[PDB]
Amino acid sequence: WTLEDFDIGRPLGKGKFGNVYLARERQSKFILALKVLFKTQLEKAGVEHQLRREVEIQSHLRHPNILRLYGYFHDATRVYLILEYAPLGTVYRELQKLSRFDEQRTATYITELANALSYCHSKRVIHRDIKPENLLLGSNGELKIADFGWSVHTLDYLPPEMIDEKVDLWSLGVLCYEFLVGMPPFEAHTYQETYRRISRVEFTFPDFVTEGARDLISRLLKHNASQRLTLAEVLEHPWIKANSS
Numbered sequence: 317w318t319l320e321d322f323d324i325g326r327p328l329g330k331g332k333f334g335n336v337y338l339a340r341e342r343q344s345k346f347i348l349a350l351k352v353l354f355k356t357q358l359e360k361a362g363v364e365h366q367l368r369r370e371v372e373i374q375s376h377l378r379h380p381n382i383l384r385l386y387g388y389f390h391d392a393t394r395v396y397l398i399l400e401y402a403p404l405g406t407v408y409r410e411l412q413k414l415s416r417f418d419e420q421r422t423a424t425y426i427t428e429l430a431n432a433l434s435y436c437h438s439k440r441v442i443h444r445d446i447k448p449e450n451l452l453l454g455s456n457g458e459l460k461i462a463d464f465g466w467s468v469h470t471l472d473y474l475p476p477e478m479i480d481e482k483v484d485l486w487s488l489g490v491l492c493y494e495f496l497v498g499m500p501p502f503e504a505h506t507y508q509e510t511y512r513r514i515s516r517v518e519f520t521f522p523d524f525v526t527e528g529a530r531d532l533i534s535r536l537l538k539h540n541a542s543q544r545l546t547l548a549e550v551l552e553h554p555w556i557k558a559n560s561s
């Protein structure tokens with residue numbers, strides 16, 4: 317694989333480590349995405365080895381709710397990822413467009429994360445970076461989890477033990493709240509305020525969040541990590557079963 321193999325389209329997203337572009341294989345016509353990472357930024361942040369970890373992890377993961385990495389290669393000062401293209405964009409963009417999600421879309425996305433994270437954990441992978449800007453939408457509106465850079469084998473999304481696998485469960489409950497409310501639950505003006513609220517698990521619901529949702533989120537956002545609700549318990553949760561497509 318080399319740059320020569322691809323036609324590049326429009327920018328899909330700007331990241332701090334690199335840019336995403338829509339692309340087409342020249343000798344397959346197949347549509348895909350291409351993420352350019354500059355070594356400059358990788359070595360100055362000391363994440364070079366992490367990228368090699370992501371690459372090996374994404375060599376083992378096949379699930380309809382996980383974005384595929386078909387392959388990778390490097391130039392002289394750039395590393396390239398060849399990714400499944402997600403036509404309908406990020407969940408983050410959609411949340412900005414809609415301002416908040418209804419119960420049905422929220423429960424459906426939460427079901428799709430949980431199936432996906434359940435598959436990861438069964439393969440001994442913890443994602444650790446669950447957040448709206450790393451959730452993508454396929455052709456049929458399907459949630460796809462992307463970006464396995466911080467995977468192992470803002471501060472708003474970190475569980476208190478970060479300020480094993482139960483971190484994904486805290487992140488999941490942060491997501492569910494953010495999906496319904498349009499703001500993550502420990503949002504504050506100062507960094508110190510935000511830290512204090514996370515450690516204390518100090519959040520409140522606006523009146524429009526229903527009892528079923530409050531229960532789900534409360535069983536997820538617990539200081540004691542091992543007492544958080546499991547992925548199987550999330551999929552079997554009454555509010556999820558009632559609202560999920």
Ligand SMILES: O=C(O)Cn1ncc2ncnc(NCCc3cnc(NC(=O)Nc4cccc(Cl)c4)s3)c21
Pocket residue numbers: 328329330333336349351363364366367370383397399400401402403405406449452462463464465
């Ligand atoms: O997301 C958008 O805003 C735009 N977008 N829109 C459609 C779309 N379809 C597919 N992919 C997109 N974006 C790339 C998603 C990633 C998948 N895998 C990644 N891996 C990674 O970032 N690794 C990584 C990063 C930094 C450091 C290190 Cl060490 C490793 S990123 C798309």
